[PDB]
Structures are given as C-alpha cells and as structure tokens.
Amino acid sequence: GMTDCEFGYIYRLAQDYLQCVLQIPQPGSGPSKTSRVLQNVAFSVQKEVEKNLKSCLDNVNVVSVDTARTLFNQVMEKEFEDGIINWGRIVTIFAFEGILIKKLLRQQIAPDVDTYKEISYFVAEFIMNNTGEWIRQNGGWENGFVKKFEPK
Amino acid sequence: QWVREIAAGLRRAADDVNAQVE
C-alpha cells in the first residue's frame, strides 16, 4: 500500500535481499511476496553485473562498513545523477548491495555478523530519500513493482 | 576511475531490465 515507501518496509526489503545472497534468510514464513519477486530479478541483474563489470569490480577493496557506504553513495550519485528513476534502476540498487556484501565477506578487516544489517540500512536511506517519492507515485511495491515484475 | 565505470554499468543493466518488463 501507500506506506510501503517508508523506511521500515524498505529496510526489510534491503535486509531480506542481503540475507538471500548470504544464504541466511529469516525463518518461518520467510520473505514477503514483494521480497520473493524482488530477489529473483535483483539476483539475475547481480550476476550479469558481476560478469560484465568483472574488471572494474576487481579494483574495489571494501574493507569496512564506512568504505562500503562511501562507495555505495558515490556509485549511486553517479548512477542517478540525471534525475531519472524507474524500476530497473531501483532493482540495480539491490543488485549492487549484493555485490558489496560479497566483497565485504571476503575483504572486511573487522568482520561482524551484523554487517549486513548496517549495509542494508544505508541502502534503505538512499532508496527512501532519493527514490521514495517516485516509488509512491508509481504504486509502491505492491501496486507498482510487484504488478509489473511478478510472473506472467 | 572505476566509480564512474560501475555506475555506467548499472545504468546499462537497469535499461536491460526496463526493456524486458515494459
């Protein structure tokens, strides 16, 4: 509904996606319908990006949460600089946090099992503050994203 | 220099997604 553009809902989506990448999803009912749809499309994008950008992704050394945030914010600023927002660009935000969590799992100097909660936090901040209005105006996650991306 | 390269790659991947669902 209209409130799915607020921080808690977005943070849960961002955290769910990292838990999918790390193979530690929440128990019970597990992820919502939105998360289930998002994880398939975001993962497909993630794999393509990892392949197509292999050479320039080898240059990055994500040694801490702070450097992950700095790189995330720099990349997002450049990706979104032209002011255009659409669902494909929103999906790439999730794909990119998946790349970052994988680099951290290998490169973080002071690894901490809560790290994915910190990464997904700054991802949610960006999505909410920079794309949340567009998301709301385009039907949110339920009436916008899921309607367009759920299976045919 | 790779910050801009990554961002350009994400813009391209986003366009591929949009081309599919739209």
Author numbering:
A (entry chain A): 0 to 151
B (entry chain B): 1 to 22
Please give me the paper's original passages concerning this structure.
Anti-apoptotic members of the Bcl-2 family are broadly recognized as promising cancer therapeutic targets. Human anti-apoptotic proteins Bcl-2, Bcl-xL, Bcl-w, Mcl-1 and Bfl-1 have a globular, helical fold and function by binding to short, α-helical Bcl-2 homology 3 (BH3) motifs in pro-apoptotic proteins, as shown in Figure 1A. Competition for binding among BH3-containing proteins regulates mitochondrial outer membrane permeabilization (MOMP), which is an irreversible step toward caspase activation and cell death. The role of anti-apoptotic protein Bfl-1 in cancer is less characterized than that of Mcl-1 or Bcl-xL, but many lines of evidence suggest that Bfl-1 is also a critical target. Thus, Bfl-1 is an intriguing therapeutic target and biomarker for resistance to cytotoxic anticancer drugs.
